[PDB]
Every structure is written in C-alpha cells, then in structure tokens.
Design an enzyme around this catalytic site. Structure first.
Site, PDB file in Angstrom:
ATOM      1  N   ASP A   5       0.866  -1.162   0.000  1.00 44.59           N
ATOM      2  CA  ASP A   5       0.000   0.000   0.000  1.00 44.59           C
ATOM      3  C   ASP A   5       0.915   1.229   0.000  1.00 44.59           C
ATOM      4  O   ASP A   5       2.098   1.125   0.351  1.00 44.59           O
ATOM      5  CB  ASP A   5      -0.879  -0.049   1.252  1.00 44.59           C
ATOM      6  CG  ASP A   5      -1.731   1.195   1.436  1.00 44.59           C
ATOM      7  OD1 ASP A   5      -1.663   1.784   2.541  1.00 44.59           O
ATOM      8  OD2 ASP A   5      -2.469   1.592   0.499  1.00 44.59           O
ATOM      9  N   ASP A  54      -6.937  -2.894   2.836  1.00 47.21           N
ATOM     10  CA  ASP A  54      -5.805  -3.816   2.704  1.00 47.21           C
ATOM     11  C   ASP A  54      -6.142  -5.172   3.321  1.00 47.21           C
ATOM     12  O   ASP A  54      -5.378  -6.127   3.183  1.00 47.21           O
ATOM     13  CB  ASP A  54      -4.545  -3.234   3.370  1.00 47.21           C
ATOM     14  CG  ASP A  54      -4.036  -1.978   2.672  1.00 47.21           C
ATOM     15  OD1 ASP A  54      -4.193  -1.878   1.437  1.00 47.21           O
ATOM     16  OD2 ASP A  54      -3.483  -1.083   3.353  1.00 47.21           O
ATOM     17  N   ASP A  56      -2.145  -0.523   5.923  1.00 42.84           N
ATOM     18  CA  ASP A  56      -2.602   0.138   7.147  1.00 42.84           C
ATOM     19  C   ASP A  56      -4.100   0.423   7.146  1.00 42.84           C
ATOM     20  O   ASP A  56      -4.650   0.876   8.147  1.00 42.84           O
ATOM     21  CB  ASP A  56      -1.847   1.457   7.336  1.00 42.84           C
ATOM     22  CG  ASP A  56      -2.277   2.516   6.345  1.00 42.84           C
ATOM     23  OD1 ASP A  56      -2.382   3.692   6.725  1.00 42.84           O
ATOM     24  OD2 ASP A  56      -2.534   2.180   5.173  1.00 42.84           O
TER      25      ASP A  56
HETATM   26 MG   LIG Z   1      -2.918   3.072   3.484  1.00 47.46          MG
END
Ligand SMILES: [Mg+2]
Ligand SMILES: *[C@@H]1O[C@H](CO)[C@@H](O[C@@H]2O[C@H](CO)[C@@H](O)[C@H](O)[C@H]2NC(C)=O)[C@H](O)[C@H]1NC(C)=O
Ligand SMILES: CC(C)CCC[C@@H](C)[C@H]1CC[C@H]2[C@@H]3CC=C4C[C@@H](O)CC[C@]4(C)[C@H]3CC[C@]12C
Ligand SMILES: *[C@@H]1O[C@H](CO)[C@@H](O)[C@H](O)[C@H]1NC(C)=O
Ligand SMILES: [K+]
Ligand SMILES: [Tl+]
Ligand SMILES: [Tl+]
Lengths: 268, 39, 992
Positions: C345, C690, C686
């Site tokens: 990410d 995700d 995070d």
């Molecule tokens: Mg992120």
C-alpha cells in the site's frame, strides 16, 4: 536414478567405502590400546563381584523348584542341571599329579601358589570328590540341592570368629577353617541335612585363593550338598540358605548376594 | 596384602559421588556466570 | 465460494430519485411505514454481519497429536502397554518398565502437542472489526417522523439521515444533501473528505457523489438517503466476508517441517519393520520382537526436535519485539525471510499520510523543503527577504490551528483542526519561523474572504505588525494561474518589479515541474494598500469588493504532497538488493501513485511506461513496443476488464509495477496473481482496504500507529512504531533463522545414530544391551535441548542480504545433504565412541570384547546367578546388570562428550570456528549445563533407581574424547575443502 547419475553414485560409494574403512581401522586401534592396558591373569576392577554370590544347581523357574514325587518326568528337568554340575567333579577328570593335588580331607587353611604370574606353570588346584557329597538319579522325593560360592580371583573367604553370639550358636564351629552355610525358613516345617568336605556344612578354605581361568584351568571349587527330607507335603516353602563370613554381605536388591532363594514344593 | 587384601574388592563410590556432585554444581555456576554476562 | 466477492460491484446510482423508490417501495419524504419496515426486516434479515464458522480449539489441539512423530510415539506408547499386558498375564512381572515407559511416551506426545499448537496459532477477528464500524443506532424517517432505531433494524428502502460525526449505517442512495462531506478511506485508503450530493457524477458507483457507503463516516454537513444495501450485501460487508472467509493456508516454514517429518518418519518405519522381521527370522519371540521395536521407535524419532524449532522461533520473535515489531503468528517469523515479492500500500505505509510542503518557487528559483518526519534533511533558504514575505502569507492567509495541549509532541506529528493544505502550510511556517500564533497576533486580521468554489482564492487583510506603518496589508492564496491573473509586480529578492513575459514563462515552467512531481501547487501574493486611500479606521466589506484584488504583487509558489516516510526509500532499495520484487498497490490516483513510486525507488531512474515512450517520441501508444517498457502503471478501471492470464502477463513482463486506484478485491487479485507464479508474497498496509490482501498474503504486515484495527487483525506482524526499516530487519532475521534451524536440526538428528546402532548390534551380535530406552529420552529430552536451542543465536556466516530469496521448491530445510552428514558421517563416529566406552566398561570389569558375542542369552537369564567372565569369575544376576547399566550411563555420557564437538561444528555450515569464533554465550551455557545435567544424572543418589543411571569412574568420562576430537577435525577439514573450492563436490554432497 533416485538421487544422482552413475558417476555420482560411484563417487559416493568410493567415499563411504574409504571413510567407513578408516573408521573401522580407528575403532580397532582404540580397542587394541585398551587391551594393551589390561592384565591376562587379573581384571582391572573387582568391586562389582566383591561380595560373592551363592548359586545352586537346581535350575529354578523363578527361584522355585516345584514337582511331584508320584511323577517321573516331574523332576527330570532339575536332574538335568544337577547332573551337568556334578558330571564335572568326576574322578576321571582329576588324574595324575598334574594339574591336581591331594589336599587335606579335613577343612584346612589357605594355599598361596605365589603371585598372579606366569612365572610358574598351571597353579595346582585341590581335588574334590563328589563322593564327599553323601546321599547325592537324585532325590526323587525331598530334593538334595547343591550349593556353590561364586569364584573370585584372589578372594580369601574369611569365616566369622566365635567372639560373640552366632545363629548356629557354637555348634561344630571350626572357627579357623570353615565358611558355614545354614538354611532356614517360625515356619519350621522341614529337616535340614548338610553334606560337604570333611562332613562339615561349609567350604574348606584350602581351595583358596582362586588364581583365575588363565592361571588355573580345570580348577574345582568346593560344593556343599543340602538335603531337605521335610516331613511336610503339598505347600510352598520359602527356604533361604545363608553363608556367613567377614567378606560376606547381602543386598535387598540382589537376592543371590551370598544367599539362596528356593521355593520347594513336593506336590505329590 | 596377602590374606588381608580386602581393599582389592572395594571402591569408594561415596567420595566419587561427593566429588561428582561438587563438579556438576560448579559447572552449573560457571555456566550461569557466562550466560549472565549480558542476560 | 468467494469468487463472486472478488468481482467489482453493480449499483443503482444511475436511476432517478423517484425511480429508485419504485425499486424499494419507498417514500422520498415520508419514508417507510412501521409495518412495511418490519415486513422487510423479516424478509431480508438484519442489517448485521455474521462471523464465519470457526474450527474449535479442541480439534485444533488433537490434529497435532497425529503428525508423523506423534503417530510413531503413539505406536510406541501402546506397544509398551501391549508388552505389559502380555507380561501381566503370562509370568507375573512385578516390574514397572513397559507400564511407566508407556506413560512417559504418552506424556511426550501431549506436551509436544502443546508446542506445535502454540506454533500453529491463528489470532483472527476480522469480522469483529468490521462489525465495530456499524453504529449502534441510526436515524430514519418512518411515517413522516424521524426516530433513532437499532441500526440492525435498518432495511432496504427506508429514509436515513446522517450528519457530521456519524457513521454511515448502510449503503445509501443520496437524495438530499447540504455541505455533506464523507471519509471514504475505508474503500480507498485516502482520508480526504469527499462531497456527497444527489446528482450522479460518475458511471463508477465507487466514485460517484450520490452514493454513501457502510464502513465510512460523515465528516461534515447533512444528508438524507435511501438504503439500497444492508448487512452482508453492502459493498464493504462483502469485503468483510471476503476477508474473514479467505482460507488461511500453510506457511513456507510449516511446509518445511512436514517435509522432514516425512523423511525421518520414512526411515523410522523402514528400519522399524526391517529389523522387526530380521529379528523373527533370527528366532526372537514376539514378546521380545515388540520390545526391540519400541526401542527402534524411540531411537529414530527425535523426541525434542519439534519443540526446539518452536523455541528457536519464539526466541527470534522476542528479539523482533524489542525492535517494535510484534509477531502475532510464530511462523511469520520466517516467511519474511523467504519473501520474493512485496505488495505495498502507499498511503500510511510508504507515506506518512500527511499533506506536507515539498517545494517553494520564489526569486525565480525552485527550493526544496524537508518532508521527513524527524526532519533528517537540510535548510533551503532563510536569507531572502522574499521568503519572509511568502512565509507571512502562508501564516496569515491560513485558518488552521493546532489542537490544545500538543506542545509536548513534535510539530509535524501534532493534530490540526483544518483542511490538509492549510495544516501543511501551518506546520511549514511553524517549523522554520517559530510560533505561527505569534505572527497572527502581531498582524491582527480585520477582514477575510474564505476560499470560495467560484473565487478559487482566499484573501485576508491584516494590520501590519510594523510600527512605522501599522497600516493594512492584503494577502491571498489560491490556484496558481488565478493568482497570476491578479498580479502586476513580483517580489524579487526583496524589491518589487514589473511582471514581464519572461518571469511569467518561468512561472509556467516552475508550475509544470512541481505539478509533474505529483504535487499540489498553490499561488501566493500580497498587496500593501495605499495609506492615504485607507485610514486607520477604514472599513472593509468582505461581501462586496470594497478593495482592489488586481495589480497585486506575486510573491511565490508552494507545492505539497503526502511524502514518503524517511526510512522508506532506503528500505525499498535494500529489499531490491536482496532480490525482492517491490510492487505498489494503492487506492490512490495514478499521478500521485507514480510520483511516490519514483520517490521511494519502486520505479528506478530512466525506466519508462508505454505512455512515457509515446509522449517522449510523440507517437501513438499502439505504435510503441510494450516490451521496451519495463515499468507500468495500471489503473483499477482497466484492471477490471483484464483476465487473470493477462494480469499474469503484466506481472511477468514488468520489473517495476504500480497498481493504482485499486479496490480491496483488486489488491487480493494482484496478491493471488503473484502467488500463482510460485512466489512467496508479503503485503504491507494500514487501511481496511488492505484487509483481504493482508489475509491472503503469505505474511501480512500492518502499521501499528497509523494502522486501522481491521488491518492489524488481518496481519501476521505489526510495526508498532511504523518503522518501515523493520521489513528489512525482518527479512534478514527470517533468513538467519532458516539457516540456524538447519544447524539445530542436524545437531539433533546426529545423535539419533548412536541411539539406533546399539539396538541393531544387540540383535545381530547377541551382546548385552549397550544403551537403554530411558537413556535415549535423557538425551533428546534432556542434554541435547539447550545446546540445540542455542544454535538459534548464531550470527550470519556471510552477508545474507546479498543473496537471492530461497527457491521454496528446491531449497529445503532438510535435504539429502543434511542426512548424509548427520546420519552417514558424524552420527556414525558418535556411535563408535559410544560402543568403545561400552567395551571399556565391560572389559575392565572382566568381560573382554571377544567373549561378549552371543552371551545375551545367558546374560539376560534371570535364573543364572553365576555367569562366567573372561577371567573365570562368577556373577549373579543383579551384579552384572549394575555393570550393564553403568554401560548405559557411560554410553549416554559418551553421546554428551561427542555432542560437544558436534555443537561446535554445527555452529557453522561453511566458515571455520576459527573465523566465526565462540561469541555465542547461550551455546557455551549449553555446553556447561549439558555436562552439569549428565554429571548430576550419574552421581545423584537415587537416580540408579528412577533412571538406572550409575556413577561413572573418572577415567570413564574420557573414553569418547578421541572420537569427539576426530569429529572436530574431520568437519573442519571438510569445510576447509568447501571454501577452498566452490566447485561442488564436497559442497553438493554435504553443504546442509
Ligand atoms: Mg494506506
Ligand atoms: C561323570 O560321572 C557320571 C556319573 O554318573 C558318569 O555317568 C555314567 O554314564 C555312563 C554312560 O552313560 C553310565 O554307564 C554310568 O552308569 C554312569 N556312572 C558312572 C559312575 O560311570 C559320566 O559319564 C561321567 N562323565 C564324564 C565326562 O566322564
Ligand atoms: C549400522 C550400519 C551397518 C548402517 C550403515 C548405513 C549406511 C549404509 C547409510 C547411512 C546413511 C546413508 C546415506 C544417507 C544419505 C545419502 C544421500 C542420498 O542422496 C543418497 C543415499 C545416501 C548416500 C545414503 C546411503 C546409505 C547410508 C550411507
Ligand atoms: C542316605 O544314604 C545312606 C546310604 O548311603 C542311608 O544309610 C541313609 O539312610 C540315607 N539318609 C537318609 C536321610 O535318607
Ligand atoms: K496472511
Ligand atoms: Tl531419538
Ligand atoms: Tl537425537
């Protein structure tokens, strides 16, 4: 193939052949040096045989010899081992002044044939007649068990002195020259009868010390025949034969450390 | 000795055990010292 | 099952408001009926998420109790009770042997079960985190009246109302809104507020303004909407199910464990039954044939090995806990070392997740600011009088403020009330000019025009802090081009000057460059109003232009971006040097995604996309050979119409990949694509978007401070300080533990041979038993334990970060080379050293090696209390047994003595001990404690009963010393050959 090619399969064989060959050659080398540090006449350690064991001829199934008097093949098993032992104490086996000697027909003192050396031939052993074993095919009724003290090189079995009290209190106490053997069971439902050298219920000290198989082959250890002409029948009788001495001790674990454990039963 | 060679069939397993246990303990302490040089 | 959920969603934002009501039998104004709502409740079911069915811990524990070694140990434990049963019936055996050994072995299985159970842990509460995002209550309009209801009682069709501060209770079709902004970070990973209005604004429902989603929250304003989806049927409720439903799967390390279990189990059953028949042929009673088998089992199975592995893993996880890297699953300690591809990410992972000033354009010059958290860069300018003029506008023409009580925390980390751009500017000036509040106190704001959608600028009028003036200063900021159309002069190095086409062109150049860097650019200008035309009491009208807004003085430009975390660029390069492929997978827009890719080193300098080639050469993209482009940037909207085979080609054909504007399922798809090619993949993230990717990853790593609860539930590892450098450490630790496990496994296995061989020679030679079954367990469960563990503390033999990731198909934890060395070479030398001490003990007590062959018959005969030794002496039963058990004790101690050398040689696979040294203090500890344990077991009174261990004479300890030394020399010579010729012979044969 499985793993590799033929060329690789060969190389892995040539390696392990030389490798294991070397290892075998090294192992053997260390065995050589071990042997080189040892005597031919006497073992390095003797503390593990120290207190002599007492073993008998009747091959006990489990410290027991039960059979039927009214049956032939009921005791023919115990007569096999009994014969095996006594067959060794033949007179034809003890011929000439070599390597046997006529010793006192009465319990005598020790005999030192020098040291544990080869500086002399075969150390001459005392003769022993199976004919000293009175009364004992064997006892088809009321067995005639044969006792034996385990051989230990350089061991001098020392009898107890009549200073204080004794089990068989002072009776026929040949204090100086006899290692006594008194069998027991309370529970006194038997009839103990002992046979041996000089008519004594012990081991004649003139058969000691033992010089070992290498310095004394054909050597004969003293026997003590014991007969139980018990007037009882059809019951397990726990009979314990005990030897007494200064160098004799016992253990709760080793039930053969200077003593017997016989479970006779004339179930007839 | 001659007939008095009782020492031939004897071994001081008691001392050996005392010494063996001393050694085991000291090796145990030494190990702690080296390990505890930083935790 | 979940293949449906891996697809992009379909919606009804295209319908009119009225049309949408027909579909759901609803009223736009009155809302649903109390009766109709309750009807729909029973129909569709609750607005809730149901957690997936889990496997109870019962079945999880017992599943370990039947994995190769435990199976063999079970066969042993029962076979003990078998022989015991056969005894208790036949001849009354007052002993406890088979009974107790059967109890001991069964305990070994249970305890070993706990270790593997501890290792195979799965702490997963994905669906629980999602459930936390549904509010307890919602506001609905029913029978023309608004009431709060249990949010679970919400159904498709009713009229819902939301306002700033509340969570979207369900997927809504916006029908009415007033200044409504929403935080869609759940779906995008981006927290910038998105406007919501009734008007449809994109074909894509995840981008349109007239849809609001469950799992997000309203940030400001008010909105009303019609519920289109409820519970599991919402967009993120499906993501929830997808994420929670995904099959976990076996880790690389787990697969390795099972693999050597098969090997060792194989040789165990082989030799087991190979000698079971070999005994019956020799005329051994089944009574004995089973007793030998039990011994064979115990000899072949390394009883303490699986627990060693677990402890070595645990200890490695403890070290990483001490670098702010939390491991939730013990196996994930190794996966990072086997990782060949990282899918990362961007926002909050690679980046700080905070709009930060990156560059400034003043004095006809581009200046760069420091974007790093801890400010690890340098200054750009302080001297220029122009800077102070620009700095003043950035502070004054700004409505952002620091939250109360932050004075303790660093400037860049403190919470700010305001939009991202104003916060960035605030923190910029506060950093390099001190307290901004001071500047706003020295220059009192009298009138302002806040940033307007139409004006595209924000202006402010302040009392000049200067005493000699104390007059009125005008400042404004806005779109760079709009600010330009309002300027006549430029503050160059202090003094103003006319805005000639020259500087105007340099402005465009500066503007295009900064924008090309993916940075948001703002214009800044001011104007000192004429004193005579503006008295100290002159009133300014903000509603109607009461003051000039043209012919102003352009001061400068400022650019900003959500920047990389300081450690990220360097960590990315380090991953790439270790041969790990790094891919970006983000919900963010392509221009931003691509710019950070270059910033952190995902896309290296000079590498082009097909679009780059086309623009440079000024040719159509179809005219470009796509193989000429090693880099690519894929938008999610294009990804959607590509098959997996085509996704596989993208993955194969590019070294530098950026997946931008991806949905959560799309991240999962990219991860699966990478895995499909046979790669071990890590995911770093995070956000809740995700979660599926993190779950599917061989190892998911979540950020600890910036991470959402969901992401950290889906992960195997948490970076508690958001230190991306930890990934680099993790992969390094992962590789090191992999090598050290080999060392520890070889060490443990090596001692199997000296435990097997005595039992074999017992049969083939008919000699007294050299080593007992109990004695074996004193080794594998006792002495070898701490030494085997200590190998986990071994330093690397070379630069492990310099090698490529292991090939999980070829590079195994236990291979033929390990067995050859442990079983064929070193263990064989240990066996002999054991036997030697055995022959020494017996020969020194009177039983010379020659007379031992074929004596076991009379030796074991309990009724022969007069066995003749070599010297003609007679032994009772218990007497010779004491010597025999003393043989077991010295054979045992011989193993310990030969394991000394083995421990030292297993220290290194390649290097010499003279190179690696002896700096492992745990290992040395192992040596001392191992020897202490052995001595204690031999000399402690009473151990002769409980374990049949007998006191050894001093000379006994030294029997195996020459064998211990040969091992050290042999292995040292062998490894000397390895190093001296990287060719292969010694290497390809023995190099673990
Ligand atoms: Mg992120
Ligand atoms: C040791 O003495 C025993 C005494 O019983 C011998 O047994 C003899 O066996 C032969 C042939 O089987 C019989 O004819 C005799 O009746 C047995 N007794 C005697 C006194 O001769 C046995 O053969 C002897 N063993 C050896 C090796 O000489
Ligand atoms: C007690 C004694 C008699 C048993 C001796 C067993 C010997 C023959 C065994 C023990 C370990 C074995 C080796 C272990 C490892 C390998 C590597 C593999 O790729 C091919 C087989 C090979 C080369 C084995 C061949 C046979 C081997 C050398
Ligand atoms: C033993 O045998 C002798 C003959 O040799 C006999 O006189 C005696 O009665 C026997 N003794 C016993 C107790 O039976
Ligand atoms: K995972
Ligand atoms: Tl083992
Ligand atoms: Tl082992």
């Amino acid at each position: 193939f499985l793993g590799r090619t033929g060329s690789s399969w060969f190389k892995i064989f040539l390696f392990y052949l030389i490798f294991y060959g070397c290892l075998a050659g090294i192992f053997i080398g260390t065995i050589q040096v071990l042997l080189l540090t040892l005597s031919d006449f006497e073992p390095k350690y003797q503390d593990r045989v120290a207190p002599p064991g007492l073993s008998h001829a009747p091959y006990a199934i489990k410290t027991e010899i039960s059979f039927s008097i009214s049956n032939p093949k009921s005791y023919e098993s115990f007569v096999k081992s009994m014969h095996k032992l006594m067959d060794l104490y033949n007179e034809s086996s003890q011929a000439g002044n070599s390597p046997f000697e006529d010793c006192s027909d009465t319990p005598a003192d020790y005999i030192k044939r020098g040291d544990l050396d080869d500086s002399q031939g075969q150390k001459k052993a005392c003769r022993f007649s199976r004919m000293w074993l009175k009364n004992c095919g064997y006892a088809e009724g009321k067995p005639c068990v044969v006792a034996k003290l385990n051989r230990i090189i350089g061991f001098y079995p020392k009898p107890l002195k009549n200073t204080t009290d004794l089990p068989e209190e002072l009776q026929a106490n040949y204090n100086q020259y006899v290692l006594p053997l008194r069998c027991a069971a309370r529970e006194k439902i038997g009839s103990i009868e002992y046979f041996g050298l000089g008519g004594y219920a012990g081991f004649p000290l003139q058969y000691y010390p033992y010089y070992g198989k290498r310095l004394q082959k054909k050597y004969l250890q003293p026997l003590l025949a014991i007969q139980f002409t018990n007037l009882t029948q059809n019951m397990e009788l726990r009979i314990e034969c005990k030897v007494y001495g200064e160098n004799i001790d016992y253990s709760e674990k080793d039930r053969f450390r200077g003593r017997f454990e016989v479970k006779i039963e004339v179930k007839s | 000795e001659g007939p008095d060679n009782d020492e031939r069939f004897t071994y001081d397993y008691y001392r050996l055990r005392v010494v063996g246990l001393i050694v085991a303990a000291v090796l145990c302490v030494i190990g702690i010292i080296i390990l505890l040089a930083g935790k | 099952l979940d293949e449906l959920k891996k697809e992009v969603s379909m919606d009804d934002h295209k319908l009119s408001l009225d049309e949408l009501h027909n579909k759901y039998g609803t009223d736009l104004t009155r809302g649903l009926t109390n009766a109709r709502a309750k009807e729909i409740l029973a129909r569709d079911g609750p607005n809730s998420l149901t957690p997936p069915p889990t496997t109870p811990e019962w079945i999880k524990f017992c599943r370990q109790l039947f994995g190769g070694f435990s199976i063999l140990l079970w066969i042993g434990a029962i076979l003990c009770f078998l022989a015991y049963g056969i005894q208790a019936a036949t001849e009354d055996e007052p002993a406890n042997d088979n009974l107790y050994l059967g109890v001991v072995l069964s305990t070994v299985v249970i305890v070993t079960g706990c270790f593997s159970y501890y290792q195979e842990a799965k702490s997963s509460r994905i669906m629980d985190s999602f459930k936390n995002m549904v509010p307890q209550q919602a506001l609905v309009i029913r029978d023309g009246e608004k009431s709060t209801i249990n949010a679970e009682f919400v159904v498709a069709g009713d009229l819902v109302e939301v306002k700033g501060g509340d969570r979207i209770p369900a997927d809504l079709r916006i029908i009415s809104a007033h200044g409504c902004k929403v935080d869609n970070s759940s779906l995008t990973g981006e927290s910038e507020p998105q406007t919501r209005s009734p008007e449809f604004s994109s074909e894509n429902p995840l981008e349109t303004r007239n849809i609001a989603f469950f799992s997000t929250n309203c940030v400001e304003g008010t909105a009303r909407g019609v519920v289109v989806y409820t519970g599991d049927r919402t967009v993120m409720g499906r993501i929830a199910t997808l994420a929670s439903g995904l099959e976990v799967g076996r880790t690389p390390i787990a697969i390795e464990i099972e693999h050597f279990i098969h090997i060792i189990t194989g040789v165990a059953v082989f030799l087991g039954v190979s000698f079971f028949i070999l005994s019956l042929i020799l005329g051994y009673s089944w009574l004995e044939a089973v007793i030998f088998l039990i011994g064979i089992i115990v000899a072949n199975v390394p009883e303490g090995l699986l627990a060693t592995v677990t402890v070595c893993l645990t200890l490695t996880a403890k070290r990483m806990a001490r670098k702010n890297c939390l491991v939730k699953n013990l196996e994930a300690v190794e996966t990072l070392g086997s990782t060949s591809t990282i899918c990362s990410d961007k926002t909050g992972t690679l980046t700080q997740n905070r709009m930060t000033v990156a560059h400034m354009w003043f004095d006809n010059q581009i200046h760069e600011a420091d974007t790093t958290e801890n400010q690890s860069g340098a200054a750009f300018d302080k001297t220029s009088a122009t800077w102070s003029a620009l700095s003043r506008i950035a502070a004054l023409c700004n409505r952002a403020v620091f939250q109360a009580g932050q004075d303790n925390v660093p400037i860049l980390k403190r919470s700010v009330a305001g939009d991202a751009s104003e916060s960035a500017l605030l923190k910029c000036i506060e950093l390099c000019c001190g307290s901004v509040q001071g500047m706003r106190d020295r220059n009192p704001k009298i009138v302002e025009i806040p940033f307007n959608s139409t004006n595209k600028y924000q202006l402010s009028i302040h009392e000049n802090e200067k005493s000699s003036e104390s007059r009125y200063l005008l400042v404004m900021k806005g779109a760079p081009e709009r600010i330009l159309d309002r300027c006549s002069t430029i503050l160059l190095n202090g003094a103003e000057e006319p805005l000639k086409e020259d500087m105007k062109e340099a402005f465009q150049n500066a503007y295009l460059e900064l924008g090309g860097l993916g940075e948001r650019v703002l214009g800044f200008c001011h104007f000192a109003l004429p004193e005579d035309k503006y008295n100290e009491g002159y009133p300014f009208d903000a509603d109607e232009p009461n003051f000039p807004t043209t012919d102003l003085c352009f001061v400068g430009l400022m650019a900003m971006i959500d920047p990389p975390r300081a450690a990220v660029p360097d960590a990315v390069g380090k991953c790439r040097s270790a041969g790990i492929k790094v891919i970006m997978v983000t919900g963010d827009h392509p221009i931003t995604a691509k710019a950070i890719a270059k910033g952190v080193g995902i896309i290296s300098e000079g590498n082009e996309t097909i679009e780059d080639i086309a623009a440079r050469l000024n040719i159509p993209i179809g005219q470009v050979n796509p193989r000429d482009a090693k880099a690519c940037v894929v938008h999610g909207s294009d990804l959607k119409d590509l098959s997996t085979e085509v996704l596989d080609d993208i993955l194969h054909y590019h070294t530098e990949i950026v997946f931008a504007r991806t949905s959560p399922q799309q991240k999962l798809i990219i991860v699966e694509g990478c895995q499909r090619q046979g790669a071990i993949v890590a995911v770093t993230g995070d956000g809740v978007n995700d979660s599926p990717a993190l779950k599917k990853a061989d190892i998911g790593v979540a950020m600890g401070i910036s991470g959402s609860d969901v992401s950290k539930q889906a992960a195997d590892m948490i970076l508690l300080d958001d230190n991306f450098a930890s990934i680099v450490t993790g992969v390094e630790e992962g590789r090191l533990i992999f090598d050290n496990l080999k060392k520890s496994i070889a060490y443990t296995l090596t001692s199997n041979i000296p435990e097997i061989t005595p039992f074999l020679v017992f049969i083939i030679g008919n000699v007294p038993l050299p080593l007992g079954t109990v004695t074996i367990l004193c080794i594998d469960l006792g002495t070898d334990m701490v030494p085997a563990i200590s190998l986990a503390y071994e330093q690397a033999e070379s630069d492990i970060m310099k090698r490529q990731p292991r090939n999980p198909k070829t590079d195994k934890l236990v291979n033929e080379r390990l067995i050859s060395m442990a079983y064929g070479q070193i263990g064989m030398i240990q066996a002999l050293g054991g036997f030697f001490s055995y022959f020494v003990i017996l020969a020194e007590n009177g039983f010379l090696p020659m007379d031992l062959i074929g004596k076991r018959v009379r030796w074991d005969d309990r009724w022969i209390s007069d066995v003749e030794d070599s010297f003609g002496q007679q032994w009772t039963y218990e007497q010779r047994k004491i010597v025999e058990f003393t043989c077991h004790t010295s054979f045992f101690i011989s193993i310990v003595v030969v394991q000394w050398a083995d421990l030292i040689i297993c220290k290194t696979r390649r290097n010499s001990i003279f190179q690696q040294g002896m700096k492992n203090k745990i290992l040395i500890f192992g040596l001392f404690e191992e020897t202490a344990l052995a001595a204690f077991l031999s000399y402690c009174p009473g151990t002769d009963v409980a374990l049949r261990m007998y006191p050894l004479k001093p000379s006994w300890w030294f029997c195996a010393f020459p064998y211990s030394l040969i091992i050290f020399l042999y292995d040292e010579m062998r490894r000397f050959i390895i190093r001296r010729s990287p060719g292969g012979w010694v290497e390809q044969e023995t190099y673990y």
